[PDB]
Design a protein around this nucleic acid. Sequence first.
DNA 1: ATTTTGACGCT
Length: 430
Amino acid sequence: GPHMATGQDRVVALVDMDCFFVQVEQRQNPHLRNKPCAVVQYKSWKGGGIIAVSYEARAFGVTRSMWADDAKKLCPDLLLAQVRESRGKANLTKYREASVEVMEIMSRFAVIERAAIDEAYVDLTSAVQERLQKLQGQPISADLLPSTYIEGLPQGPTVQKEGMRKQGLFQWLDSLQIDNLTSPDLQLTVGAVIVEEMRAAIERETGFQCSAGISHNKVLAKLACGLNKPNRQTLVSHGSVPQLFSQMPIRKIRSLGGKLGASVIEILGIEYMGELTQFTESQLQSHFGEKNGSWLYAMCRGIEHDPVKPRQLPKTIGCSKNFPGKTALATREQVQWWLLQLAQELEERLTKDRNDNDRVATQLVVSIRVQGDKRLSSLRRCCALTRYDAHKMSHDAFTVIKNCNTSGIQTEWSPPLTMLFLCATKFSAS
DNA sequence: ATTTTGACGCT
Ligand SMILES: [Ca+2]
Ligand SMILES: [Mg+2]
Ligand SMILES: [Mg+2]
């Protein structure tokens, strides 16, 4: 009752660039705009692996992870842009730099947590308070929310998508109590106004469109963001949670898409997030551990406390390459040459990072996979990263991994290596 | 033969 927390203390948004690598390539090459197109890495093996797909091409069934040759079977007019290749490997610099463009714009509005190359959480609580004080009891016009969906509306006593969107927004705004500045629904609504402004600024200043979710925590904001894509934003209120979760597969909630969510489904014999409400906190802790159990107990009620962390920059800078099938590295010279390629890309990115961001990495992590091992990484070792020098870093990585070679032959490497991975970590201010 | 990333939890 009067003491039960409701998780309505913050306004949190999640902003997600639509088909991001595709938009970067479409901005650069106008011939690709408004066409079925995809971004592909490499080209020799089956036309290359697709890593991003425009919504026009998704309509044909083209997906990420698909080989371009197969996608062309679904979509014969599919246009393709290739990721740059440098030093023998795919090089993602263009997309990292485009990401910085967008994150710097978002940071003008509020504190952001970089969640991936194309998405960030936004803590809007303070910005909403200030905007509410500026408004001075003035109602919020639908014109301030031209791309916003209110999840769960319209309801109760038009057959077009935009007409439905507007009907629901009208019902929401008609019900709103705009004179209580502490009202969580009003706070979410002002948050959505700010996110419309943020998304307009991103599009004006970069050309890139994005979607967004606005709710009271990160998990609900992330879920909301996916409800109406592309180029739209969705407000998920606390009150919408019971209906939304009542048919929501557990795997759709962030962190439950893998083994833990599978165990929740199997052990409890349920399918939907809302079904979790029927268990006590102790029951859930008994099955899934103290932390996970408490988290699930709160989350199925719409409540999550994970903070938006103030972190706009990645914590690690890494470079990796797979060597599948017959290309697995089987000689020492091969291993050393590719460690050098990876180390040279790493040195370039690290020097740029030091100049831009006033920090230096202090640890070098070396990871390899051996042929036959099902795990993505077979071995991980660390060593000191004391100089931004590619020859030193590659020599050090070889030193820490050279004892993995079973081969009694000096020149040969066995078992063959199917993956090399160098990662700079443990940054310190510089 | 997806590939190339990135963050965080466990012990
Ligand atoms: Ca995206
Ligand atoms: Mg995606
Ligand atoms: Mg994303």
